Amino acid sequence: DETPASYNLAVRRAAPAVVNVYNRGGSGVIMDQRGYIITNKHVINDADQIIVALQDGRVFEALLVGSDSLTDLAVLKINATGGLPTIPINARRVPHIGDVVLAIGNGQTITQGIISATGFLQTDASINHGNSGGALVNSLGELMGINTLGIGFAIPFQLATKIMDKLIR
Amino acid sequence: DETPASYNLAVRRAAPAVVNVYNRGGSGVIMDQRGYIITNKHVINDADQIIVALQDGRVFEALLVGSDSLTDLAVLKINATGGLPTIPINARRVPHIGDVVLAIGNGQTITQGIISATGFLQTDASINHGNSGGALVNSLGELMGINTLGIGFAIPFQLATKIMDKLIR
Amino acid sequence: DETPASYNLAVRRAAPAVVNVYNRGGSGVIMDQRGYIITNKHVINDADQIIVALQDGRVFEALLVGSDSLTDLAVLKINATGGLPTIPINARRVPHIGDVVLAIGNGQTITQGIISATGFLQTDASINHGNSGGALVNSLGELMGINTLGIGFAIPFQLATKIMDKLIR
């Protein structure tokens, strides 16, 4: 009949770029075409072998670029091939309180909510060990933050961008 | 003044069809005019007498048509009278991830959320023993699933439709 | 680029009027210019000195006007100065089930949800000891209720208005 209210647009626009992290004898986000992926520290602590899994079926072995114990963030590196799904980033967008946000983690689950505060970034979107290290995007799909660990916490994409660049030293 | 953002439309369109189940010395959904009602198995296990209560005030004694231990579903039957409120069904609607959904259970409570995954159907709408067996509809009121038992689970209306038809054997 | 789905409008329209309550050796809401503030009883029980903190930075010492053990409500009084941010009230608005609502409490956190029932007022917006006594507004910012203590509870603004007026005796 008509159009059901949905945020699927932001899903098919951001979800592809979110991956799953594993250990061969956690969540992650594809930042740029170079193949850099932001995740969490507690996800890679004592990692024998880091593995990345895309939604399209592709599987990679990830390289630990570096981590930051302060913000619990970590950067990974995979062999950038032809055609990588990257997380939509908008450095001009200013996260206002009340903005609708989706939390993308892991089975690939999508929770809905809003920006509670911007003190870090608080959100009422269901966060857990599954989506810990996943993405946080607005209705447009623009990355607002990186989920961390009755209210959830993420790291502003602005900050995460900086920290990522510094870990590449 | 102006119009407050609301999903009341889907409420006055689906809520009437959702009923309450009891035992005379759980939730349920009115499917068709014939008087068939889908509920959960754990709701009728060891039932002395099944009772159905509509939102309009009408009260009925329900008949156990049959259950399916696999999907935890059950079908009831009440004497179809003149004028039954049926749950809006749309077999053409395809549940996409990110779609806004309401969870209708039981006091008649309405929780809001989205479709997390479609693996079953995951949703961040608050689900509990109250709405266990209730309806799950989009902003249009179209039945998306039947709630079951930090993330909730429902059964695709497509599947539930089949299983219901088979229990009528 | 474009416009991200958000309820920030209701925030910059209601949040200023919500304050924080303290005890000098809880949440509250600025009702009118006179300086009357609605809060919860359990927040002021055994209070040595009641203190009110606005979002603009202003700090006041509050006066206990009176409380109502029944609805767990309480009314405070501060020296009404020039220019007070008051909570948007609309006595003509009728709270329908399914309406989008924000819960404003305390760091100043904003949770999103809907009106579940209107029996009291039920809401799936995350409520806790933080926002206990805070505001509950629709997408327009119009006060729908006062939060109290897997589902949250508030008091209809219609009722709270009456009880407030009676405590001023």
Swiss-Prot record, chains A, B, C:
Residue numbers annotated as active site: H42 (charge relay system), D72 (charge relay system), S132 (charge relay system)
Subcellular location: Cell inner membrane
Effect of loss of the gene: Small, slowly growing colonies. 5-fold decrease in basal sigma-E (RpoE) activity, loss of regular growth regulation of sigma-E. No proteolysis of full-length RseA.
Additional notes on this entry: Regulated intramembrane proteolysis (RIP) occurs when an extracytoplasmic signal triggers a concerted proteolytic cascade to transmit information and elicit cellular responses. A membrane-spanning regulatory substrate protein is first cut extracytoplasmically (site-1 protease, S1P, this enzyme), then within the membrane itself (site-2 protease, S2P), while cytoplasmic proteases finish degrading the regulatory protein, liberating the effector protein.
Family, as annotated: Belongs to the peptidase S1C family.
Free-text function comment from the UniProt entry: A site-1 protease (S1P) that cleaves the peptide bond between 'Val-148' and 'Ser-149' in RseA. Part of a regulated intramembrane proteolysis (RIP) cascade. When heat shock or other environmental stresses disrupt protein folding in the periplasm, DegS senses the accumulation of unassembled outer membrane porins (OMP) and then initiates RseA (anti sigma-E factor) degradation by cleaving its periplasmic domain, making it a substrate for subsequent cleavage by RseP.
Subunit (UniProt): Homotrimer.
Description of its domains: The PDZ domain probably binds peptides ending with C-terminal Tyr-X-Phe sequences, which activates proteolysis. In the absence of OMP peptides the PDZ domain inhibits peptidase activity.
Record's protein name: Serine endoprotease DegS
Organism phylogeny: Bacteria, Pseudomonadati, Pseudomonadota, Gammaproteobacteria, Enterobacterales
Gene (UniProt): degS
Residue span relative to the full protein: 41 to 250 of 355
